[PDB]
Design a protein around this ligand. Structure first.
Ligand SMILES: O=c1ccn([C@@H]2O[C@H](COP(=O)(O)OP(=O)(O)OP(=O)(O)O)[C@@H](O)[C@H]2O)c(=O)[nH]1
Ligand SMILES: [Cl-]
Ligand SMILES: [Mg+2]
Ligand SMILES: [Mg+2]
Ligand SMILES: [Mg+2]
Ligand code: NA
Length: 327
DNA sequence: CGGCATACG
DNA sequence: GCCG
């Protein structure tokens, strides 16, 4: 089992779901307390289990697996022996964890804002609604729409949305294309949002595109919230429903076609997969990877890529299709 | 021990 | 919390 998640296939569904879920609770809790290192280790240990070909049934099966030391092994040992890990259950019921989860789940609220509100004594969404002078417009939108944004987006919802984005993109710039990215591209059946990547086959034609797209969607009454030159938008869309509608988070990204493979790779995730791939690139290959390109800092050159396959080849990694990037 | 992904809004 |  290789040490980096980008070196092994990780499918969406697997054989150690309960064990990985428990480790991910500890990872999430570590993040809420500011310990990015502990978050990463628990995430990485969880992802190792997702990559295994069969269920872990005995503690000896952890021997030799990367990212399993005393603490993560103890968690698995307790789950195997008693079906529950006391540390995990203590986190689950804790007021700190439940409130930090509630607050950070809001669009526009991160760990630092959540933590400050927690220390001020706030605990519930109505606590926040009862003090709106403390909220940004973005947080106000996140809170107004919180109930709809807490409802999973379905694959049926994605198709209807891609059509309306394509319509607006077509008027804004004929020939521009719309690609579904994020978790739905990895095969998820549900999501917290819908992620799209937009480009045009003629380098440079994509400049200035996203304002033209957003104004056109806004004119059609489909935009419940957006931030407004720019190339990423984080929006809330009005999506039709039987006899009504619901609010859905939609992310739009524009990239020049020269950068499209890097932007596609970077937007397809998973989040852990991309962190691990970028860590691998820098630490093992000495190359700097981001959503725009791959930089050789010794030669001071960028690697031209025509496909995601090119990027995996230039990093010396076996190609993984999106469905196997569910780290 | 140091390191832990990345840049735009 | 774990790796090198
Ligand atoms: O912290 C982050 C968040 C996101 N991303 C990159 O942005 C993509 C979209 O980020 P999303 O937050 O939309 O996640 P997701 O689509 O993978 O899953 P859902 O929760 O939406 O169902 C991710 O897949 C990843 O590529 C990062 O690189 N880092
Ligand atoms: Cl590989
Ligand atoms: Mg998404
Ligand atoms: Mg998104
Ligand atoms: Mg230390
Ligand atoms: Na948030």
């Amino acid at each position: 089992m290789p040490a980096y998640a980008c070196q092994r296939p990780t499918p969406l569904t697997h054989h150690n779901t309960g064990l990985s879920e428990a480790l991910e609770i500890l990872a999430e809790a570590a993040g809420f307390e500011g310990s990015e290192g502990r978050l990463l280790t628990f995430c990485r240990a969880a992802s190792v289990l997702k990559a295994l070909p069969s269920p872990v049934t005995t503690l000896s099966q952890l021997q030799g697996l990367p990212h399993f030391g005393e603490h993560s092994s103890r968690v698995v040992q307790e789950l195997l022996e008693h079906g529950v890990c006391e540390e995990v259950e203590r986190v689950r019921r804790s007021e700190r964890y439940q409130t930090m989860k509630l607050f950070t789940q809001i669009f526009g609220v991160g760990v630092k804002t959540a933590d400050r509100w927690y220390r001020e004594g706030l605990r519930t969404l109505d606590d926040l609604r009862e003090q709106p002078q403390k909220l940004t417009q973005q947080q106000k939108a996140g809170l107004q729409h919180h109930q709809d944004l807490s409802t999973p987006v379905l694959r049926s919802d994605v198709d209807a949305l891609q059509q309306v984005v394509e319509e607006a993109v077509g008027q804004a710039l004929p020939g521009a294309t719309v690609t579904l990215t994020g978790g739905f591209r990895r095969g998820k059946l549900q999501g917290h949002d819908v992620d799209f990547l937009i480009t045009h086959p003629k380098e440079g034609q994509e400049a200035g595109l996203l304002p033209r797209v957003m104004c056109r969607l806004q004119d059609q009454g489909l935009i419940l919230y957006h931030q407004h030159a720019f190339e990423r938008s984080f929006c809330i869309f009005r999506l039709p429903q039987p006899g009504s509608w619901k609010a859905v988070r939609v992310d739009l990204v524009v990239a020049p076609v020269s950068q499209f493979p890097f932007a596609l790779l970077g937007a397809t995730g998973s989040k852990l997969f991309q962190r691990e791939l970028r860590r691998f690139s820098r630490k093992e290959k000495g190359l700097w990877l981001n959503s725009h390109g791959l930089f050789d800092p010794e030669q001071k050159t960028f690697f031209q890529a025509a496909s995601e396959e090119d990027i995996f080849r230039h990093l010396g990694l076996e190609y993984l299709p999106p469905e196997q990037r569910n780290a």
